Ligand binder design. Structure first.
Ligand SMILES: O=C(Nc1cnn2c1CNCC2)c1cccc2ncccc12
Lengths: 39, 157
Protein backbone atom coordinates (compact mmCIF):
# COMPACT_ATOMS: atom_id res chain seq x y z
CA UNK A 1 0.00 0.00 0.00
CA UNK A 2 1.67 3.13 -1.44
CA UNK A 3 1.79 6.63 0.14
CA UNK A 4 3.16 10.01 -0.89
CA UNK A 5 5.55 12.46 0.98
CA UNK A 6 6.31 16.06 -0.25
CA UNK A 7 9.98 16.45 -1.41
CA UNK A 8 10.21 20.05 -2.78
CA UNK A 9 8.91 22.92 -4.92
CA UNK A 10 9.05 22.79 -8.72
CA UNK A 11 11.40 25.74 -9.48
CA UNK A 12 14.18 26.40 -12.02
CA UNK A 13 17.43 26.88 -9.97
CA UNK A 14 20.09 29.26 -11.43
CA UNK A 15 23.56 27.58 -11.40
CA UNK A 16 22.48 23.91 -11.02
CA UNK A 17 25.07 21.17 -11.96
CA UNK A 18 25.08 21.19 -15.82
CA UNK A 19 25.79 17.60 -17.07
CA UNK A 20 24.82 14.74 -19.47
CA UNK A 21 25.07 14.73 -23.32
CA UNK A 22 22.31 15.08 -26.05
CA UNK A 23 22.21 11.93 -28.27
CA UNK A 24 19.91 11.35 -31.33
CA UNK A 25 18.64 7.71 -31.01
CA UNK A 26 16.27 5.67 -33.33
CA UNK A 27 13.74 4.03 -30.91
CA UNK A 28 10.53 1.90 -31.14
CA UNK A 29 7.68 2.01 -28.57
CA UNK A 30 5.87 -1.31 -27.98
CA UNK A 31 2.31 -1.87 -26.72
CA UNK A 32 3.63 -2.55 -23.14
CA UNK A 33 5.14 1.02 -23.03
CA UNK A 34 8.80 -0.22 -23.39
CA UNK A 35 11.19 1.77 -25.68
CA UNK A 36 13.82 -0.22 -27.57
CA UNK A 37 16.75 0.62 -29.93
CA UNK A 38 16.06 0.17 -33.63
CA UNK A 39 19.61 -0.34 -35.03
CA UNK B 1 -7.20 14.89 4.63
CA UNK B 2 -4.86 15.27 2.71
CA UNK B 3 -1.71 17.15 1.51
CA UNK B 4 -2.77 18.87 -1.80
CA UNK B 5 0.04 21.52 -2.01
CA UNK B 6 1.66 21.82 -5.48
CA UNK B 7 5.22 20.41 -5.79
CA UNK B 8 7.21 17.17 -6.24
CA UNK B 9 6.50 14.12 -4.00
CA UNK B 10 8.05 10.72 -3.23
CA UNK B 11 5.97 7.57 -3.87
CA UNK B 12 6.77 5.03 -1.14
CA UNK B 13 5.79 1.43 -0.33
CA UNK B 14 5.80 -0.50 3.04
CA UNK B 15 5.09 -3.78 1.09
CA UNK B 16 8.86 -4.59 0.96
CA UNK B 17 11.70 -4.37 3.55
CA UNK B 18 11.34 -1.10 5.57
CA UNK B 19 9.98 1.88 3.51
CA UNK B 20 11.09 1.65 -0.19
CA UNK B 21 10.85 4.54 -2.74
CA UNK B 22 9.19 3.09 -5.93
CA UNK B 23 9.02 6.51 -7.66
CA UNK B 24 8.20 10.29 -7.73
CA UNK B 25 5.30 12.49 -9.00
CA UNK B 26 3.93 16.03 -9.45
CA UNK B 27 1.02 17.62 -7.55
CA UNK B 28 -0.54 20.40 -9.73
CA UNK B 29 -4.03 21.96 -9.48
CA UNK B 30 -5.21 19.13 -7.12
CA UNK B 31 -4.07 16.29 -9.47
CA UNK B 32 -1.19 13.86 -8.78
CA UNK B 33 0.78 12.92 -11.98
CA UNK B 34 3.21 9.94 -12.01
CA UNK B 35 4.36 7.17 -14.40
CA UNK B 36 2.07 4.09 -14.72
CA UNK B 37 4.88 1.54 -13.96
CA UNK B 38 5.41 3.24 -10.50
CA UNK B 39 1.84 2.56 -9.10
CA UNK B 40 0.48 0.13 -11.75
CA UNK B 41 -2.77 2.15 -11.26
CA UNK B 42 -3.08 1.32 -7.48
CA UNK B 43 -4.61 3.86 -5.02
CA UNK B 44 -2.32 6.09 -2.86
CA UNK B 45 -2.45 7.36 0.73
CA UNK B 46 -1.61 11.01 1.64
CA UNK B 47 -1.76 10.98 5.48
CA UNK B 48 -5.35 9.85 6.23
CA UNK B 49 -6.38 11.00 2.68
CA UNK B 50 -7.01 8.59 -0.27
CA UNK B 51 -5.95 9.38 -3.89
CA UNK B 52 -7.89 7.39 -6.57
CA UNK B 53 -6.57 6.84 -10.14
CA UNK B 54 -8.56 8.95 -12.68
CA UNK B 55 -6.78 8.46 -16.02
CA UNK B 56 -3.96 6.25 -17.28
CA UNK B 57 -2.32 4.56 -20.25
CA UNK B 58 0.30 1.72 -20.03
CA UNK B 59 1.66 2.73 -23.46
CA UNK B 60 2.27 6.45 -22.69
CA UNK B 61 3.33 5.04 -19.22
CA UNK B 62 1.42 7.88 -17.39
CA UNK B 63 -1.35 8.08 -14.74
CA UNK B 64 -3.23 10.94 -12.98
CA UNK B 65 -4.97 10.84 -9.55
CA UNK B 66 -8.07 12.87 -8.43
CA UNK B 67 -8.50 14.45 -11.89
CA UNK B 68 -7.52 14.76 -15.58
CA UNK B 69 -3.83 15.18 -16.62
CA UNK B 70 -3.05 18.96 -16.05
CA UNK B 71 0.57 19.34 -17.41
CA UNK B 72 0.70 20.68 -21.00
CA UNK B 73 4.01 22.62 -21.29
CA UNK B 74 6.36 21.28 -24.07
CA UNK B 75 10.17 21.30 -24.69
CA UNK B 76 10.75 24.03 -27.35
CA UNK B 77 13.39 21.73 -29.10
CA UNK B 78 16.29 24.22 -28.52
CA UNK B 79 16.86 25.27 -24.84
CA UNK B 80 18.50 23.38 -21.90
CA UNK B 81 16.04 21.93 -19.24
CA UNK B 82 16.25 20.80 -15.56
CA UNK B 83 15.58 17.32 -14.28
CA UNK B 84 14.27 17.91 -10.73
CA UNK B 85 15.64 14.44 -9.68
CA UNK B 86 14.27 12.99 -6.34
CA UNK B 87 16.50 9.89 -5.85
CA UNK B 88 15.66 7.39 -3.05
CA UNK B 89 16.82 8.58 0.46
CA UNK B 90 18.43 11.75 -1.09
CA UNK B 91 17.31 15.42 -1.30
CA UNK B 92 15.51 16.83 -4.41
CA UNK B 93 18.26 18.14 -6.78
CA UNK B 94 18.03 20.22 -10.06
CA UNK B 95 20.31 19.02 -12.94
CA UNK B 96 20.54 21.13 -16.11
CA UNK B 97 21.00 19.30 -19.46
CA UNK B 98 20.40 19.82 -23.22
CA UNK B 99 18.00 17.02 -24.23
CA UNK B 100 18.79 14.69 -27.13
CA UNK B 101 16.10 13.20 -29.46
CA UNK B 102 14.23 9.90 -29.65
CA UNK B 103 13.28 9.42 -33.37
CA UNK B 104 10.13 7.20 -33.69
CA UNK B 105 7.91 6.29 -36.68
CA UNK B 106 5.20 8.43 -34.89
CA UNK B 107 7.74 11.29 -34.65
CA UNK B 108 10.47 12.93 -32.52
CA UNK B 109 10.53 13.10 -28.63
CA UNK B 110 12.93 15.00 -26.29
CA UNK B 111 15.31 12.69 -24.38
CA UNK B 112 17.43 13.36 -21.21
CA UNK B 113 20.75 11.41 -20.85
CA UNK B 114 20.94 11.30 -17.00
CA UNK B 115 21.32 7.98 -15.09
CA UNK B 116 19.45 7.56 -11.74
CA UNK B 117 17.97 4.65 -9.72
CA UNK B 118 14.60 3.32 -11.11
CA UNK B 119 13.04 4.68 -7.86
CA UNK B 120 13.63 8.14 -9.40
CA UNK B 121 10.92 7.35 -12.11
CA UNK B 122 8.31 10.17 -12.18
CA UNK B 123 10.78 13.01 -11.47
CA UNK B 124 9.70 16.18 -13.43
CA UNK B 125 11.54 17.96 -16.26
CA UNK B 126 11.20 21.79 -16.23
CA UNK B 127 11.55 24.71 -18.70
CA UNK B 128 13.25 28.03 -17.64
CA UNK B 129 9.78 29.32 -16.55
CA UNK B 130 9.52 26.39 -14.03
CA UNK B 131 6.69 24.69 -16.14
CA UNK B 132 6.70 20.82 -16.12
CA UNK B 133 7.34 19.74 -19.73
CA UNK B 134 7.35 15.98 -18.88
CA UNK B 135 8.36 13.16 -16.50
CA UNK B 136 11.59 11.06 -16.36
CA UNK B 137 11.51 7.22 -16.04
CA UNK B 138 10.55 5.72 -19.48
CA UNK B 139 13.50 5.12 -21.83
CA UNK B 140 16.31 2.81 -22.96
CA UNK B 141 19.80 1.38 -22.14
CA UNK B 142 22.40 2.43 -24.81
CA UNK B 143 25.59 0.58 -26.01
CA UNK B 144 27.47 2.43 -23.18
CA UNK B 145 25.29 0.63 -20.55
CA UNK B 146 23.98 4.13 -19.55
CA UNK B 147 20.32 5.23 -19.46
CA UNK B 148 18.40 7.77 -21.65
CA UNK B 149 14.77 8.79 -20.58
CA UNK B 150 11.99 10.12 -22.90
CA UNK B 151 10.62 13.55 -21.82
CA UNK B 152 7.13 11.85 -21.39
CA UNK B 153 4.22 14.44 -21.45
CA UNK B 154 0.42 13.74 -21.32
CA UNK B 155 -2.44 15.64 -23.04
CA UNK B 156 -4.58 18.28 -21.19
CA UNK B 157 -8.32 18.19 -22.27
O1 LIG C 1 11.95 0.64 -14.05
C1 LIG C 1 12.37 1.10 -15.11
N1 LIG C 1 11.57 1.28 -16.19
C2 LIG C 1 10.34 0.64 -16.37
C3 LIG C 1 9.79 -0.32 -15.53
N2 LIG C 1 8.61 -0.70 -16.00
N3 LIG C 1 8.39 0.01 -17.17
C4 LIG C 1 9.44 0.83 -17.40
C5 LIG C 1 9.46 1.71 -18.60
N4 LIG C 1 8.46 1.25 -19.57
C6 LIG C 1 7.13 1.02 -18.96
C7 LIG C 1 7.19 -0.13 -17.98
C8 LIG C 1 13.82 1.47 -15.23
C9 LIG C 1 14.72 0.48 -15.48
C10 LIG C 1 16.10 0.75 -15.59
C11 LIG C 1 16.57 2.01 -15.41
C12 LIG C 1 15.68 3.07 -15.14
N5 LIG C 1 16.22 4.33 -14.99
C13 LIG C 1 15.38 5.31 -14.73
C14 LIG C 1 13.98 5.16 -14.62
C15 LIG C 1 13.43 3.92 -14.78
C16 LIG C 1 14.28 2.81 -15.05
Amino acid sequence: DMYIERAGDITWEKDAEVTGNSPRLDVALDESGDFSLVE
Amino acid sequence: KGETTDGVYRVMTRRLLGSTQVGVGVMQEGVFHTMWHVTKGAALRSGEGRLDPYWGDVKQDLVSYCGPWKLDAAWDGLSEVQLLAVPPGERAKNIQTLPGIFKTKDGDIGAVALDYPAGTSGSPILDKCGRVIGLYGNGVVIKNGSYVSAITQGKRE
